[PDB]
Structures are given as structure tokens and as C-alpha cells.
Design a protein around this ligand. Structure first.
Ligand code: HEM
Ligand SMILES: [Cl-]
Ligand SMILES: [Cl-]
Length: 222
């Protein structure tokens, strides 16, 4: 009805660019990532996806959300697998959520009570990004931390054979959404909001990464 697929893509161009330039991210890209700080990121996303996937299931048959309801995208379980790897068997007891992460979860829950359609901005921001960057991020992680196997279940969509073909069904799904350009714009704005929320989680880890860096180099000089 409106073609938000291209509106979201062009509309979040700037934000995605700022995302790549966050200190934490810059270091990640250049291969310097470390188990302890990255472990906290996984804990946060774990709660955000839980929130999002639970609410999305309530709207499996909603006039709008039902169109972008692909339980094949669900990351909660794979993320639990990663916590197990980074934290071990007692992970339920060691995993925690940060303030930014809580704010993130809070927004998802809020939007789900008064503007369920804004949930497409959240599904878009996470899932379509996970789908598109998943392979690059996985290798960089695997190389920078040595994860021959385990620790990257999050970047692997098991229940999706042809992912490029899924990425189309998904964009298509968005382009066939029963919404008016007015709201389609509230969705785009919400997407830029979500990006900022991801970026805030990354910034929370800057300090943890600095120490770790100082520690490895100090150990090197010694
Ligand atoms: C704040 C964290 C990030 C979020 C929320 C995010 C989300 C997204 C979204 C929603 C898209 C789909 C755009 C579209 O086709 O409409 C996308 C594309 C992509 N992202 Fe990210 N992204 C983030 C950071 C990164 C990072 C750190 C990299 C660099 C390794 C990256 C690599 C990519 C790639 C390679 C694509 C595919 C571009 C294309 O379709 O031509 N992303 N991302
Ligand atoms: Cl992009
Ligand atoms: Cl905000």
C-alpha cells in the first residue's frame, strides 16, 4: 500500500552509518573484541529479543503485524545458546541487563500496548539487520575471539535455507502492509529510535573494552 521497505532503508541510512562509527563498534570491526564486554551485549539482546518475540506472538493474527510474523526469525533460543557458551551452565544466574538494555526492553513493551504497528520498526531494525550483516559479524567475532564452534549461534538462522530469498519475502511483506503513508512515517522514525537504543548499549561497553585493551597490551609489554 505504501512501500515502507525502501522508506525504512533510505530513512535509516544516516543512523546505520553512526552505528558503524561508535567506538566500541569501530574496535569490533578492526577485530578487537573481547569475551567479557561482548558477553554483556549478548545478555542485553537476549532480553530485548525475548520481549519482542513474546509480544509479536500475541499479534500473530493482528491486521498488520501478522504480515511480518516469521517465527523463523526468532533469536531468543539461539541467544540462550550463546549465553550458555559465554557464561556456562549457571548462565540463568549470571546474566544481567544494563540500564540501556532495560530502556530498550521498556520501549518494546510500551509500543506493544499503545502502537503495535511501531513493532514493525523494531522487527525491521533487528531481524533485517541480523539477516543482512549476520555473516560478516560472525566471522569477525569468530576470528577476534577464536570460536571454532560455539558462541555465534545468534548469527545463524537455522530454519532459513535460502536467506536471500527470505530477505525478499520479508521486504515484500512490508511493502504489502495495510498502512497509510502517515503512519509509515511514524514507523521510520521509530526505527531511527531503535538504532539509537542499540548504540547506547554499545557505548555502555566502551569503558569495559578500554580496560581489556589496556590489559592485553600491558601483558604484551610485560
Ligand atoms: C546499531 C547496530 C546495527 C543495526 C541495528 C543494523 C541494522 C541493519 C538493518 C535494519 C539493515 C537493513 C537495511 C535495508 O536493506 O533496508 C542493515 C544492513 C546491513 N548491515 Fe547493519 N546494522 C547495525 C550495524 C552494522 C554493523 C556494525 C555492520 C558492519 C559489519 C553492519 C553491516 C550491515 C550490512 C553489510 C548490511 C547489508 C546492506 C545491504 O543490504 O546492502 N550493520 N543493518
Ligand atoms: Cl545500509
Ligand atoms: Cl527516544
Amino acid at each position: 500500500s505504501v512501500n515502507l521497505a525502501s522508506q525504512l532503508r533510505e530513512g535509516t541510512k544516516k543512523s546505520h552509518s553512526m552505528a558503524e562509527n561508535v567506538g566500541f563498534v569501530k574496535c569490533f570491526l578492526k577485530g578487537v573484541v573481547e569475551k567479557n564486554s561482548y558477553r554483556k551485549l549478548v545478555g542485553n539482546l537476549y532480553f530485548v529479543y525475548s520481549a519482542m518475540e513474546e509480544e509479536m506472538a500475541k499479534f500473530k493474527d493482528h491486521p498488520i503485524l501478522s504480515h511480518i510474523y516469521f517465527p523463523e526469525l526468532n533469536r531468543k533460543q539461539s541467544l540462550e545458546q550463546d549465553l550458555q557458551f559465554y557464561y556456562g551452565s549457571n548462565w540463568r544466574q549470571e546474566v544481567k541487563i544494563s540500564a540501556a538494555g532495560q530502556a530498550y526492553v521498556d520501549r518494546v513493551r510500551q509500543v506493544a500496548a499503545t502502537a503495535p504497528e511501531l513493532l514493525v520498526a523494531h522487527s525491521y531494525t533487528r531481524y533485517l539487520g541480523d539477516l543482512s550483516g549476520g555473516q560478516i559479524l560472525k566471522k569477525i567475532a569468530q576470528n577476534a575471539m577464536n570460536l571454532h564452534d560455539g558462541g555465534t549461534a545468534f548469527y545463524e538462522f537455522a530454519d532459513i535455507d535460502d536467506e536471500k530469498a527470505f530477505k525478499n519475502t520479508y521486504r515484500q511483506a512490508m511493502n504489502d502492509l495495510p498502512i497509510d503513508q502517515a503512519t509509515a512515517e511514524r514507523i521510520v522514525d521509530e526505527a531511527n529510535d531503535a538504532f539509537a537504543m542499540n548504540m547506547k548499549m554499545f557505548n555502555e561497553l566502551e569503558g569495559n573494552l578500554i580496560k581489556a585493551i589496556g590489559i592485553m597490551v600491558f601483558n604484551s609489554l610485560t
